[PDB]
Amino acid sequence: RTLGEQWKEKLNAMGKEEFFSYRKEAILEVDRTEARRARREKVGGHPVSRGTAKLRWLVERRFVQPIGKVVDLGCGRGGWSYYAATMKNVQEVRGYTKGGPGHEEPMLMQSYGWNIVTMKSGVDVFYKPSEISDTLLCDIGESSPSAEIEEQRTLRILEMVSDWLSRGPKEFCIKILCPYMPKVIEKLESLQRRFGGGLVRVPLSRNSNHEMYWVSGASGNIVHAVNMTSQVLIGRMDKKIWKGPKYEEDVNLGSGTRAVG
């Protein structure tokens, strides 16, 4: 089996306290306390989720550069959608998410560029015909203790996103739930040859998942990138002393309506 599969099994065998220490070991973490305390209480620029910080991390390093019409698949509360709205060359943001019981509904915010954001709930993207976009974002992937179940879920997401990518967005950022399973690596290699990009591990991701982002501004060997992530994750297991996370300031999303080019 792959190193990721080994990681997965060891993760599944962990105790409660061990698991909770491990998931944040040596990760980058946003101080969400201030943002999430404003949940029960929209112009303060506080992001709706920790997802915003992940997208900033990628954009800040030019792994993706949102432009024109942005489509955000599985937008949830809208962390990525509202971040995209603050990008210089973005003109429109369209978010889709399933919502309903047990799932996130879009949160209407008045952060900067809110006037160009529309998010629609009650949309299962596996039945949604594709549309033209300039930037395609997708953050879909339900975790499972089974790598085989995650593999199938990941292949289904990849089949679905291929339709959107064939519409010509040059900028994209797609969550790969289970990048380490053989069938997923195979599909990624064909899609990389077809659409470009590469896989990046965002250090804000918890050690409890192996998610990697397929992004347009990356390049290089997928197998190697996945393997190095597996080894780093396994390397953080069973430490003698837990050092904990490293903290960074949350994203500032500003306020009010925006002009677009």
Ligand SMILES: Nc1ncnc2c1ncn2[C@@H]1O[C@H](CSCC[C@H](N)C(=O)O)[C@@H](O)[C@H]1O
């Ligand atoms: N088949 C499907 N169709 C539409 N949305 C789905 C879906 N399966 C899962 N989702 C949604 O996809 C979301 C992924 S989490 C999205 C986080 C977002 N990037 C942010 O920054 O806030 C979840 O809210 C989940 O409800």
Ligand SMILES: [Cl-]
């Ligand atoms: Cl899924």
Ligand SMILES: [Cl-]
């Ligand atoms: Cl702000």
Ligand SMILES: [Cl-]
């Ligand atoms: Cl403006």
